[PDB]
Amino acid sequence: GASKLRAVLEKLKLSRDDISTAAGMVKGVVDHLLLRLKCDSAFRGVGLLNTGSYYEHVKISAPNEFDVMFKLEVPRIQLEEYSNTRAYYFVKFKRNPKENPLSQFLEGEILSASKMLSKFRKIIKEEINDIKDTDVIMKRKRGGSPAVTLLISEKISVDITLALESKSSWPASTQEGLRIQNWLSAKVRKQLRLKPFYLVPKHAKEQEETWRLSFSHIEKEILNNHGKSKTCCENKEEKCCRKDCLKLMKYLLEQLKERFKDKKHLDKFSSYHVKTAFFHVCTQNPQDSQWDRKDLGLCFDNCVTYFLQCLRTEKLENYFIPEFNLFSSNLIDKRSKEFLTKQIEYERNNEFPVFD
Ligand SMILES: O=c1cc(C(F)(F)F)[nH]c2nc(NCc3ccc(-c4ccccc4)cc3)nn12
């Protein structure tokens, strides 16, 4: 039944590529926000994580929902790992010029996120206040990241996440992660780990001024140069279905979350979990011939199958930090993962009614 999957991918491709003023409205707003933040002492070097691509989408099915990252480089920071969480960190400074521009957000040794955010959110509030032309509103909701959600017009939503950028070596918790060696090669892994890493404000539970590692730039680089062969998806004789399988996994989850948004059992699942499981299947199946365009149906099924295995065993290691179990029962409880298991098996056994 790979014929249905192709049609699903065609609709999704058409929706995304259809002419839209959305990206241009959000560019206008983001560009005003950046200039106004660049005028303030603490945010002088703030900039876009992806330049030219204001249109990063979390929900592959929601074209009016945008997700942007404002990065700010911090030199010579000291990370202290928080509570053996492996992913969450206190941000200290080596502070050899003690007058670092973020000195105003200090609480002794420790960089305060809630303070940085409240000022970030206040500068942003002061520019969405001075909006010319089109109308935009700030929907300030809980959670440190995204910092704010902007609503433009009736349909457009922009999540803005603030991120510290570190150009030093990745924390030890990543040392055994990104296990792409038998897929993208050991030399690519080394290249990637020379790239910076990011830290976004975040709490482990739902108290403390912690930051969480973010590697969305590495995920993007992998997806756009994803084959074992350097020529994967350039020709037609080596055209693969890796990106299609990811889009199908994302769209399955988004459709099931929408189908059950009144029951809450699926609220903790996100794109992270499907992207992570996908990349694990990329390591398991490193050959481009295991992702043949013609095998879209079988390839999708391996992804669904592996995702179901993660759910039932309650194990899904973060791709960058192998000791962080995304499916631990402290993050998602057994009944929630068992609920999702049942719905996906119902989809697979009825030829995915969410793809009708
Ligand atoms: O940008 C990307 C892309 C991917 C991938 F594409 F592979 F999925 N994994 C990835 N891990 C990180 N940072 C570490 C980290 C991030 C998130 C959480 C978390 C925990 C609980 C709930 C929700 C999230 C824990 C640790 N960044 N990052």
Ligand SMILES: [Zn+2]
């Ligand atoms: Zn490919």
